[PDB]
């Protein structure tokens, strides 16, 4: 169970996050630094971005799932996103 | 046609790049200073390995990927790594 919901208050107009896409989830490359999602600390570069609010990407394209979050993310008030937690290492 | 070939002649015993599972391909979370990715410049985080050598990671779980790609790298030799190219963009 790798999945978690994070609560961002956005009363900030950018979650600052890079987010990738590739030619059910959208990656997320870096957080840049400030917030909103380097001030709560919770969301990391590798996790997968798979909902935000009730607007869910596992079924959509990478490109209706940008202009979706980018749609919210200029909505007035707080915003949830759904993450599932990645695992990394080095070779 | 996104995906390119990456040579790399490995007579470095660790490729530096820090790759990322989640609970079609591996993605590259990092890439460690210094080589032997670094060193060849062409991947980038945020770009998606699909296949080592001859050994294709499309159809592969993440933990045999990550197995076959360790045993290959622990090869004397060059290695030869298949890589999607991603795009990215801020929100």
Same mark, same amino acid.
């Given at each position: 169970?790798?999945?978690?919901?994070?609560?961002?208050?956005?009363?900030?107009?950018?979650? &600052?996050?890079?987010?990738?896409?590739?030619? &059910? &989830?959208?990656?997320? &490359?870096?957080?840049?630094?400030?917030?909103?999602?380097?001030?709560?600390?919770?969301?990391?570069?590798?996790?997968?971005?798979?909902?935000?609010?009730?607007?869910?990407?596992?079924?959509?394209?990478?490109?209706?799932?940008?202009?979706?979050?980018?749609?919210?993310?200029?909505?007035?008030?707080?915003?949830?996103?759904?993450?599932?937690?990645?695992?990394?290492?080095?070779?």
């Amino acid at each position: 169970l790798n999945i978690i919901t994070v609560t961002l208050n956005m009363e900030y107009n950018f979650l &600052g996050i890079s987010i990738v896409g590739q030619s &059910g &989830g959208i990656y997320i &490359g870096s957080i840049m630094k400030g917030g909103a999602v380097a001030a709560d600390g919770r969301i990391e570069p590798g996790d997968m971005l798979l909902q935000v609010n009730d607007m869910n990407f596992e079924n959509m394209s990478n490109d209706d799932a940008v202009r979706v979050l980018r749609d919210i993310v200029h909505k007035p008030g707080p915003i949830v996103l759904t993450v599932a937690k990645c695992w990394e290492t080095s070779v």
